[model samples]
Target: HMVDMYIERAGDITWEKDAEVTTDGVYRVMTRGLLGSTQVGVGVMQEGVFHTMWHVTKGSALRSGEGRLDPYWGDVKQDLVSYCGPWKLDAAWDGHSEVQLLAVPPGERARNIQTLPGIFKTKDGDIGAVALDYPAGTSGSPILDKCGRVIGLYGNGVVIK
Candidate 1:
């Protein structure tokens, strides 16, 4: 039930070796657009690209509120924003990964944040059961681990599964 996936890299880095999915690298996870002002979620970045999906965004905005018409929006599992990590957690915890939510002020894009673990319940079930505490407008956010690995997406208190 992946709802969204896209890329987000607000930095400039030049590689010295050929690009071919190297074993390790660096990337940043942040929120944007409607979900920016409010809500929180995770975004996974791999090879300078983003990929994830969890909840409905576009259509929900249109129907629930006087939201704008973004031609890029969709009704089905759509690409919203985009992560990596928990290579072992994926197998050990059956897709669960420790995550750290981030926060950067509007005038302070260079800033960042560190967070701890919490619990959340969705319409389907509890986030602790492979999800996190999420509410409305958090669609497409990446659920990451302490290592910044994308675990899964959760929002509107609804399980992606």
Candidate 2:
């Protein structure tokens, strides 16, 4: 019964490209935030912009504008950050995931991440959490579909259940 419910809800998700996850679409993100400490996370490139969590960029020296983006399989790194407005943050307890957007470096091709199928309802109602197995330092990994499209961002693992 639970499986059926998941399937039904998942089917309702929509994708911008409606394609599988491509190898070159996602990039690994590294930023300095929170007490001026360096951290790693994952982000997707879409329409010449890099998308990631605010917590990943918050309190960083690059928060004003610009960051670093590394390819999933290359030694080369790209500059990521936008001086323009659109940097928004949301409360997780309010059922929102805070996101930050930065301008993609010139001549970069990136892809959009899709929303996950089901929901993890909380006292705040559907905080958008999903269950999955992951290790430490997997905070910003993209939760991808079979086609390689992103469904959600892997935040952290739950010890119970």
Candidate 3:
């Protein structure tokens, strides 16, 4: 891969100053980089928590959201077939700007986000009334405004409708 990792954030992404992300608390990615020519993704947690963005996302299992969540997120969080890894996100062809994550997102089940009436947008941000004709088993999480912060996780890849 020419450039294996990059960071982009959008919407409400949290940032911390030298914060350490952990496994027990929620986290947001603030930066992703190339460590010694190796692609790397890193982020910070609330206070002492330190971990990769996906590390927490794949583990959180979509808790009841600030103790609450959208009806769709809640439902998909239940039926998902979980998986894990250092997923790679692919930017659309010829610098299309739109990137799609490659991995089977963890959770209970795949979700279907509908922006316009009767549409299906997945977790990564593909709209086709149903899951798009993506890889048989791959997905990406949300793209933070400029960092690795996660917006959401599912079939959409890393964006929304």
lDDT of each: 0.32, 0.33, 0.28
TM-score of each: 0.35, 0.38, 0.22
Candidate 3 accuracy as lDDT: 0.28
Instruction: Give the runs in model 2 whose Cα sits over 4 Å from its true position.
Output: 1-24, 31-39, 59-118, 146-149, 156-161
What TM-score, to 2 decimals, does candidate 3 have? 0.22
lDDT by residue for model 3 (16-121), tens: 3332111323222221235432212222222322223343233333222133111111124322222222222322222122222212222222222222112345
Question: lDDT-based ranking, best first?
Answer: 2, 1, 3
Candidate 1: deviation at residue 89, Å? Answer: 12
TM-score preference between candidates 2 and 3, better one: 2
Q: Please say which candidate is ahead in TM-score: 1 or 3.
A: 1
Which pairs of residues have clashing backbones in candidate 2?
Answer: 20-147, 21-147, 21-148, 21-149
lDDT of 1 by residue, 42-156 (tens): 3333453333342333222111022221222222433343222222223111234344333222223321223334556666566543323433333443334444444544442
